[PDB]
Amino acid sequence: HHMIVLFVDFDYFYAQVEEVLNPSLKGKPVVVCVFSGRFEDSGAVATANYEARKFGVKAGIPIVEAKKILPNAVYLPMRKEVYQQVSSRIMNLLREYSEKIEIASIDEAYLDISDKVRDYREAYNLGLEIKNKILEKEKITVTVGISKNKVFAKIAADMAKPNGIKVIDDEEVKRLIRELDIADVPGIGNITAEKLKKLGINKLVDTLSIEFDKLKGMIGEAKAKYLISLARDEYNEPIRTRVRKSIGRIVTMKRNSRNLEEIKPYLFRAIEESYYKLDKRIPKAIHVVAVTEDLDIVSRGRTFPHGISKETAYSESVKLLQKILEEDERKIRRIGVRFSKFI
DNA sequence: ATTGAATCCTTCCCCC
DNA sequence: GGGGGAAGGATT
Ligand SMILES: Nc1ccn([C@H]2C[C@H](O)[C@@H](COP(=O)(O)OP(=O)(O)OP(=O)(O)O)O2)c(=O)n1
Numbered sequence: 306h307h308m309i310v311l312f313v314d315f316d317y318f319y320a321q322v323e324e325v326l327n328p329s330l331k332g333k334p335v336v337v338c339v340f341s342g343r344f345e346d347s348g349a350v351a352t353a354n355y356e357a358r359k360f361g362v363k364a365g366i367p368i369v370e371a372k373k374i375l376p377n378a379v380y381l382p383m384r385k386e387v388y389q390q391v392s393s394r395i396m397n398l399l400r401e402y403s404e405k406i407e408i409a410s411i412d413e414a415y416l417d418i419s420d421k422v423r424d425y426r427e428a429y430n431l432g433l434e435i436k437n438k439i440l441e442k443e444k445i446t447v448t449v450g451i452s453k454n455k456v457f458a459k460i461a462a463d464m465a466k467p468n469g470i471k472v473i474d475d476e477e478v479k480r481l482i483r484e485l486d487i488a489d490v491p492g493i494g495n496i497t498a499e500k501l502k503k504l505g506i507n508k509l510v511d512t513l514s515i516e517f518d519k520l521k522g523m524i525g526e527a528k529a530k531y532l533i534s535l536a537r538d539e540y541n542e543p544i545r546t547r548v549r550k551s552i553g554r555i556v557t558m559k560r561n562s563r564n565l566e567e568i569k570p571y572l573f574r575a576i577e578e579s580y581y582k583l584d585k586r587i588p589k590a591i592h593v594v595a596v597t598e599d600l601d602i603v604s605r606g607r608t609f610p611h612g613i614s615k616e617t618a619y620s621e622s623v624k625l626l627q628k629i630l631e632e633d634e635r636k637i638r639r640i641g642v643r644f645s646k647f648i
Numbered sequence: 649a650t651t652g653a654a655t656c657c658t659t660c661c662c663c664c
Numbered sequence: 665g666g667g668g669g670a671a672g673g674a675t676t
Pocket residue numbers: 314315316317318319352410411412413676
């Protein structure tokens with residue numbers, strides 16, 4: 306009668322991988338950070354286990370104000386590389402419960418189990434063989450979501466977490482389509498959470514009050530045609546294998562600068578590790594982005610008829626860096642690169 | 649107040 | 665306006 310989307314989402318993943326390697330931390334509040342040798346203890350949180358969130362230590366906030374909230378808690382520099390090996394291992398596992406996998410991010414996969422589950426009953430059934438396998442061969446807990454489409458399966462997971470599992474039968478959908486808050490619909494942030502709020506929309510069903518031709522100039526086609534597409538219990542987007550369309554790095558400079566010969570070594574580092582992550586792909590395009598003193602991003606790109614040798618990237622960055630320097634007047638505080646249009 | 653990394657949607661311009 | 669290229673925008 307339709308499709309069943311199974312969504313797996315790792316719990317406080319980054320932090321949880323720190324525990325799985327060093328239980329000399331479980332129970333205690335773990336905070337995964339990122340800095341730069343800037344001032345010291347400067348940067349932003351990446352994620353924190355649940356025993357640290359209760360106190361106001363979520364991702365995003367500067368590790369600085371976090372200390373004044375939990376000077377007791379354990380702070381760990383982030384090892385993105387480590388979490389990535391764990392993740393590629395869990396992912397490969399899921400890969401054998403359905404060849405119809407996606408992988409929204411490093412800790413999210415969407416499985417299309419419509420082919421191996423006659424009904425939600427057996428879905429939940431797989432919902433658990435899975436949670437257990439993952440927890441067995443990785444000692445990691447994951448929350449699972451199940452429903453008719455990728456969007457709701459996610460919303461599910463984000464309710465059953467942590468460590469949970471949940472289901473949303475056509476009935477609960479309609480109940481959520483009229484009851485779930487709006488700032489909770491996957492794909493909406495505070496910015497769009499304002500236009501919708503005051504305009505006849507406080508909840509997903511509200512986007513049914515007003516016609517798109519009035520919001521299709523407030524949140525723009527794709528978005529509106531997407532919200533409404535849901536409330537109007539019509540949404541049914543497929544589970545396609547996501548592809549990496551851009552890799553790159555950006556670093557943070559000790560001091561803010563505008564002296565091109567000072568910046569260049571930074572930009573080059575960014576290109577080298579950036580070219581490492583790039584593995585064995587060949588970008589035809591390339592952009593240089595810089596974070597000025599007042600976090601206002603400025604980027605400049607170039608696209609070629611052919612791939613970009615590393616030797617040519619190094620050389621093509623400066624021009625893009627200079628282009629920036631001339632036009633924009635402010636200083637530079639964060640400089641990096643980003644390759645695109647892969648062959 | 650710093651530090652990721654990526655998507656995809658949008659919006660202003662050349663050009664058959 | 666359409667291909668596509670380009671720089672800023674708004675989530676995750
Ligand atoms: N500004 C943001 C917001 C989100 N994300 C990513 C981080 C997560 O890993 C992924 C989203 O997954 P979830 O919100 O479902 O949370 P998870 O439980 O998988 O992640 P977390 O490690 O926070 O528990 O999107 C990101 O990179 N940058």
